[model samples]
Target: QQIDWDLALIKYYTSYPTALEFSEDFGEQAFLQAVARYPERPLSLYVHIPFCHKLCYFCGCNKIVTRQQHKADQYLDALEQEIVHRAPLFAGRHVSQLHWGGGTPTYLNKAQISRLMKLLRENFQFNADAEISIEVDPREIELDVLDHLRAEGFNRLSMGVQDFNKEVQRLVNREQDEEFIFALLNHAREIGFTSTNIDLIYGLPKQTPESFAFTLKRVAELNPDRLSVFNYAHLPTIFAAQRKIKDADLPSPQQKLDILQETIAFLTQSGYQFIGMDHFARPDDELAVAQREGVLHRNFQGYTTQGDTDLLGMGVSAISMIGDCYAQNQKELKQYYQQVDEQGNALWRGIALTRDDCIRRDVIKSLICNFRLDYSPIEQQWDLLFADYFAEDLKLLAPLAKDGLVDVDEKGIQVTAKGRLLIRNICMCFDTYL
Candidate 1:
């Protein structure tokens, strides 16, 4: 039997180096220089809130499971110091976007959330129309909190509703009433959030195609502005939290494929444009429009409309993408606090991207976002013959081309719809690290 490379190589490509290669050897000087690289670049701020009230076993994010508010209190104290320390370097730059993510961002009470936003607003020069977004858990918030967030200028809300099935929720240990989520969605609509995104995960334990189709239909009815259907990667040994998930319960590869096939057909037919790999949006959504205009971008945050701006991630395990450098904060809460108290910033490790790295990033991003690659722009910018520089990579893509996944010619590569499901496999061909 032919190997199913799509299922076998289902990895998401966020950044080139990946976090595995980050090291202390990159040094504080490298981070300082990186921040100074492009003082005028539009900035995208990401604030990490690492505390969660309960453990969601399927999650692989960097988080501390706790109900203790003081931990958050301490985290905020350090976070503020880091903000003050780093704000100077970004003084003249405009803030184009802001994102709050976490163990669960809504875990912070109203007062804490307000205080954090206030500090950031005071320190940064924000564009009047900046896009501010946050990841929220509906179970942790009240309707008034939604109002408060809108008033505070949070225009986007990304809510995770992995599955509506009770058995599936129980298996993943993240049970939230479906009725409550719908109610929450209704209130968010009334509150006037500019964008609402719903997240769904397939290939979870006990998720048959029929069960997953139910979730897809319900979310389609909800009609969120954006949707993300992620493939569940069950690696118990690496994540540790995933160890609780019974191995036998995971759906077979064929069953998983069925779920994905059903998801694409249903979502596309329901009027959501497949914005490539795991994301879909309304035809008029910013992502879809960006794709049409050839301006869409992919970053560590998956797909973003604000990709032109340099990312500045602040908090434990947060990553910052400055001019040509990638820097990460201390992953451990205790260490982050210690470093923040001592140095006013907690920059643990990072890499200074070479010119080649920058060129390849654009190539991968262009294909991933637009589903088409025009070699002219890249050639003009880097002054290199694309065919000559990437000859071997092109050779690697011949098999995929034969499979009808892509059309490659003298001009560029065009990814077919079938290829979109396995875009990462194509992207891996350009990854020199591998």
Candidate 2:
């Protein structure tokens, strides 16, 4: 019953099997088999644009910092090769969702952006109502490029605002004028983008509850459809750039928790529904609606409405979850190019989930996405007694249950509001590897 709720809630659990358990020697044969097995499953595409104009000290993403335009052009060439080679394999499936993420997807020029979209449309049969989204940096992109993106059928935009506090921005080396960001938001609305999401990071160097309140107030004025307030995980050992930030300048654990609690209170009070794991959306937003209907899904792209579809990711360091397998491309730009040039595709390493993994994934996804899990479905679908199978997991969850984080009865488990913030810890109980 002695649970450290503060530490538990801040912990992140993004994927199952965890990337640490991935086998470098694993090939694409398993993924190919999965594709063939589920030929008609709706496909989702992820294109990683791993080029950034400059590196932010807080960033740990696989990206190349370069100002050379020709490098991006060559990257696109490699991307096109991978797409052409991989697209033919899923013959009859149509793409229902497409996402562009990266260091900064908006770093591409207008023509380069159009070229990439054109080639994508040429190879895949995109559903007329496909959810085409891209991660954009307000500082790197211009107003005209926003128009080009909308004209090309991009309906969703996720902007990295991080923080609106000037001092925090300066410390992170990602300064942006608040007015400029407002202009981009205004332009996105004018262009009829279906949804706009703003990402805010707490626990940054020099960040405090007072300063973040101003950021929150400014963000509320813009009134984004969705907001993702993420806790900044500072790991200087893993990300070298993070070393630039002083440990002393970081918020204390208590202070960080205060920021989180205040953030949750402010956003929910400002007509946003807390949609689990740092995400908040308007009541009518699709994410909120999906959660209400228990159809929300978590993937490599965070919460998604298209989780039922198979995901196909291209570009350097991208990942794909197809059928029972997960595959990731090479992380190094040079290695990615060489592999695509020689083999027409880059398949570096991955893991194929077993039946047990699938079972646990269902439990984890259901709990994380909807904050509840029913025992009947798993029993009926997997043809096993849920209680007997997960007896050990139940034992692990006893302490959390005693602390009232979760309610566990014979029927299932329901994560309380307090538990919802620490859903990863609850889900971790079901993980066989852990």
Candidate 3:
């Protein structure tokens, strides 16, 4: 029950400066190379659907709001071509998971979803038990669409139920009520979907502790396979839609922290296993199983049980982790279309990683996924590089060790359960100084 609030604040502040310096110094090439070296591993795929019928006030995702079917058609054409173009690289590798994340993947018609799945199956080797998932907007989706998604090989669904309170929903401009969500979850279960995840955001406008607690109780009663309760990060400067929310309507920082603490307490008490940052799962959920087995991995999509297979992303602003390299497609629709039309490939800005980049990335990945690092394993793996590297990290983390955030013993460095909140800061110890 000990809350190291000061250390938490320091971790939050340090993230910005550390990320800025890392981006400026290493550039994208280092990260790309880090991804490229692990091509044959079982890969998880993330397809970005950047179209939405309505824009939510709290959304900061890369998406466009439109009701036009023609634009979607055009985007799909580019998507197919991009998928075909990248298929050759991962011809034999097996894809253990595929996730369709979006502005709202449910915005796509059933036929379109079917076609995309068909292409994925034809190009990549999917496991018989692949955890295919899609983000759904409950209000926008129909029963038929759900059936179609299930038929098209999507076994898991992540429903965006930011809040069930009418006032909070109105404030956030994403009004999917409890009744609709209940119907959606019931329908998904009826259709024989393997898993369902409900996403919630606490600390919304007018979201008091009492109201949020009510929401949590209701969600727990429903007993979905997984839950993701996210902290509301109100940075209107970066997200234009968030600017519509008046300053007076927002919660104070202390209120936000209280909401988070209360949520963690309630969820853990309700028998939900905390499967690391921002996620909770039932003991039987595959994610929880993976965490228990220490097989969890982190990528662009956060946490996964998939191995390190080559990732080929299709669609506007999508990124792919190809062998030893990482590449991103054009962000703008026009640029994306033009690139695909001209070159038959949508790759835009990209970077190939160096040897040093690969080793450093492995260290970072281990810290993020396992919340600990075995220097001996790293040393045995990289030999000379491990012996020479991380001198600065040793010096930087000395003070943090004294502060009790982390324990660095002969075996390796282990992040305490409390220090898990500051994992990013711990990872920064190994980052090259800017």
Candidate 4:
């Protein structure tokens, strides 16, 4: 069986009107169940730093503006407490990945970062070849900070460079200039970071196809190891900062699409390979290498080359997935401290997985990450465990197969080339509505 590409896209756009709607509660419980079913897998850690020097007008991440050293010290203390409380849960698991993401991970001074890293090392056993990455703001990082990060065991860096154009920077309130960014990149190279990635956005106010094209060309010229071009979702109703921008300043749908198209053309033409949705890499980049070796994986941090692992999340509003369950810490700083003070841990919400949820999750994860699925592998792995669980899904996929979006054969199903661009839509075919 095969599926139609065009109709699948149409179905995707009409039925799943918003990206948020599409990913809403998707396999939420099932994802936790799958992790539980495979507890022996290596564990991953994500630490969120919610403080920023200043909030960008177009930002939507969970962050607060604070410059007080005392506040930062308190936050780190609470984070360390949370880490200590949860580290014992993965006593026998290896830690394969550690990601520090935030308003600006480098926002912390050297001593604060050292304290956090030392606590992590004390409680968790890092794999000899673990990938430790931190998200940084170029304007905020210095050579000393880079040295501290390296000495503290962080090997990879993700710099947020939304746009280098000064006018666009003013409109977005991000205020970073190209000279500062180039110097940062040079410094990262000089310090011998294993990998460098730049995060760019495409739909900010005052962004045009030409302006974005110029930015893309310049970024390619700089030749970072990885590039992530994300679409700017303007949801003022959900993100308070977005409300500051006038509606007329924002790009239209067609304009956004043009930016995406131009970026693809420019990056691919510049000799970068499209590893998957929104990510491009040089031919020798780890992600590119992982894709070739079929080792690429996806988690909350986006695409990675690491093996699947249990995730431990620390800090306010962090969520962790460990063996068949999902747990989230309190988002409110005061609540987090209160819970930690009382119980030595801050766990506010959690869900344990059921057997059936695991099977669905396996299929859904493959569809989302690999842009393809092999039904037999899934069936062979879980048929006895989840008999007929996906029988209805097979029936649902028949039309898609006829449309040539997927090729269903005796071994399994593979998404066609045309289907690759619409991988999210393909995954929706198997979504279980909450």
- Judged by lDDT, which candidate is best? 2
How well does candidate 3 match the true structure in TM-score terms? 0.89
The top-ranked prediction according to TM-score is 2
* Residue 329 lDDT in candidate 4: 72
Query: What digit string (tens of lDDT, one per residue) describes model 1 on residues 278-321?
Result: 88888898888989898998778878777767899999999999
Scanning candidate 3 in windows of ten residues, the lowest lDDT window is: 13-22
The lDDT for every candidate, in the order shown, is 0.86, 0.87, 0.75, 0.75
Candidate 1: stretches off by over 4 Å: 1-12
* TM-score (all chains, Cα) for each model: 0.96, 0.96, 0.89, 0.89
Q: Name every residue pair that clashes in candidate 3.
A: 33-353, 36-323, 36-324, 36-325, 37-324, 41-308, 41-309, 42-309, 43-309
- Candidate 2 residue-wise lDDT, 235-314, digit = tens: 99989999999999999988888898888788878998888888888889888899989999988888988777899999
lDDT of 3 by residue, 1-434 (tens): 22233535344422212222222243344544554466567766778898998879988788999989667777788878877876676776778889888778888887788878887898888899888999998886777788888778888888888887889988878877687788879889999986688889887789888788888889887778888888877899988999988878778777777777788778878878777668888777767787657667766666777756666677887776667566677778889899888877666666555666667777777777677777887787777544347777778888877777788876688877667667777878777643
List, residue by residue over 1-434, the lDDT tens digit for candidate 4: 12222433545421112122222243434443545577578889999898898879888887877767577888898887777777776677788899998767888999999999888888988898888999998775666788889888888999999887778899888897688788777778888886688989988989999899888778876778888888887899988888888889888877887787667767877877777777878878777787666567777777777655777788887777667556667777788889888877766765554565556566666665566666667767765522256567678777788876778865667877667666766666666653
User: RMSD to the native, candidate 2?
Assistant: 2.6
**Superposed Cα deviation of residue 430, candidate 3 (Å):** 2.0
Give the CA lDDT, 0 to 100, for residue 176 in model 2. 89
Model 3 lDDT at residue 174: 80
Q: Please say which candidate is ahead in TM-score: 2 or 3.
A: 2
